[PDB]
Amino acid sequence: MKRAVITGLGIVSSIGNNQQEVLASLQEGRSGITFAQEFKDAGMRSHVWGDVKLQSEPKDLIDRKVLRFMSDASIYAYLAMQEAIADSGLSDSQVSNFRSGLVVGSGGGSPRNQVAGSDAMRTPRGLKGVGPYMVTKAMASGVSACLATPFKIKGVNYSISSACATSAHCIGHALELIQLGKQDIVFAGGGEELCWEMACEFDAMGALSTKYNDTPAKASRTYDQDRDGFVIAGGGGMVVVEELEHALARGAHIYAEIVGYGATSDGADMVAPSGEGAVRCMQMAMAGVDTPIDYMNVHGTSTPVGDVKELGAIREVFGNNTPAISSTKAMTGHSLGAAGVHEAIFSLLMVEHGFIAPSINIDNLDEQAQGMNIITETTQRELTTVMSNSFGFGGTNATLVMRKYQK
Amino acid sequence: MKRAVITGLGIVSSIGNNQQEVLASLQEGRSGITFAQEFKDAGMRSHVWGDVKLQSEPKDLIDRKVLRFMSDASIYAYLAMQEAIADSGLSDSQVSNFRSGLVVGSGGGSPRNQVAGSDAMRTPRGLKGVGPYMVTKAMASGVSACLATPFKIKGVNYSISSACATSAHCIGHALELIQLGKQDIVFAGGGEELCWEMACEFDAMGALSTKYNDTPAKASRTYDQDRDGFVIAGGGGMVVVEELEHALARGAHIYAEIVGYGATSDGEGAVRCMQMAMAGVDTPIDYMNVHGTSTPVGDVKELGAIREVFGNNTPAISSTKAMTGHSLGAAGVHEAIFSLLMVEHGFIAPSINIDNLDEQAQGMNIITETTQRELTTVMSNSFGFGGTNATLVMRKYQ
Ligand SMILES: [K+]
Ligand SMILES: [K+]
Fold first, then answer.
1. Gene3D superfamilies from the entry (chain A) (predicted)?
2. Does the distance separating the beta carbons of A176 and B204 come in below 8 Å?
3. Nearest to A200 by CA among A112, A272, A132, A281
């Protein structure tokens, strides 16, 4: 059946606002984590975040007619999509085409705008204080709605949401649409705002790191024995998924082919992973792939329970004969809705540039990871096939396998 | 290619908490719209809603351990899913199976819980006030996560959100998963809470009815010249989408086959959506459940698209929204369910409150009185804000 390739990428993250900045950070093993005064001021225990530091204010980067409908998740996704379109070399007639779609999601929509609106409604500002653009800022589908219009998308247009797996499921579904022969191009990705309004929910459940506020760059430390929760982050990412013959026909640059996609459910525990659903997810994505997995960008968020469940799943699939492993979250933080596309992009850059980004802050490796091929220093290596895992709350799992395209 | 059929349904809506109640409402042309004191107290202009009227509090209907993680959208979808599982006749090993999945969405997730959490942080209780179950209540995917865990779903598990089209895309995607040979069963639907926190956003953009607050049952009036906005509603709905051979082999009751699914974007989009869903369908469209939410511009845009596809030679047409209001995330699955009941029971629900037909609908086959009729193929449109379109075509299984 039809094959899908990635021909363009765009990204706004805690370690870079475009692929050049991100590539440099990945090669340097640079942390994007910083102290979050906003969180301290809000009364939270976690005072660290993977913040997006844009070059200018959004009003100076995006047309006001487009910007008036957006929450930060949409701003990030939009900037990422502009980059991806430029990178892909697509013309307006290919971006706006009956066979070109958009599948982009957010894990949380926009609690900041939602709260701003509800606060205004409870003051004399009333309905005028809410404003007429709140629906696109606050609804769950905001990120797809805010992008479909400005780019004049004519194909599919919707959001997939699934916590940490959100944008991984978006990319996988783009593969499915290409496989079904329904679309030739699908812009897939996600966005996530960074705010105390949403972050406090995670802190209230004890999911966030709180013991490293004085040394922010050391807080996120996947697979380290002294990890104490993830570091919340924001951002956006977009990849241009394209049917193979269509990409070849126009002379597109092919980063990789999406050769595997797994999507499963744990059917147990509402907040932490069970490992068994993760095992099936990895196995499903590896089905039919006739090459070994050279590198894997783990889900590994730096939580005590979560990291261990994933390691157990990895051992069930590969024993100690694992692919090279690193958690980029140790550097970037957990960007929730944007995590899947961010990590797919980090993996594509490692493939394109022949290197493995280090898994930082591992002072003492968790015993469950002993024996595995954990990379802790930037390593040059020819990577052919890569895998990226995304296991979100509610027991939802996604795994993508990508491979260099053989001309 | 694999074929998909619907073998079970469940529903919580403004016109009924089960299929028998919903059927009676549809046949009688009964409005589910009532006066919303909550909206008046909030300072909104629209004081009408399609409220879900559960007799009991959710704590008396759902296990306490499961309920702690849920927002109202999840509560409604969960109850709809219980009804669907029961209706489907599926065994526990078919509900919890590697080849059985769940694709359920919500238009807004839980604005009430996003606000409740933030309000708590601003009080002395702080983090303790927020509590540890707020993420599952407030996250966009809450409605899929809160059902996947308790029903022990092992297959796909995620939400699709697209405003008014949400649950229609969920059903269409269930069909795609069956077609790809990835799942044998997919529980598809949606849920939406009813709350001023979200409703005021619609009132703020002038999309809600505000001139018929003194006669709520007459506020939602799709295709009527004096319509002035939609009436917001809440609820949940779920359908069991199943691969054909699998349904036949277990002796399932088959409501209909999903023979078409279109999904497009405006960027004519509606026309293309309808045409896509009708591709390969070798029978005429007997009845169409329109998107028609009762907005001045929206209704005319849809009428224009219908006219482009069918001219005046349209299938029989009615808007059940005139009775139920607009349930956003749950609208697609609710309307799919109403259409299946019309097929199963051989009748066309009336499009009520049309005192003066909009000039743009002149010549079309708009049904305004309940009509008994053998329906074989039906279509349901869901054209949501953001220019996202979904159309489903279902047909009796021969
Ligand atoms: K990953
Ligand atoms: K409809």
1. 3.40.47.10
2. no
3. A112
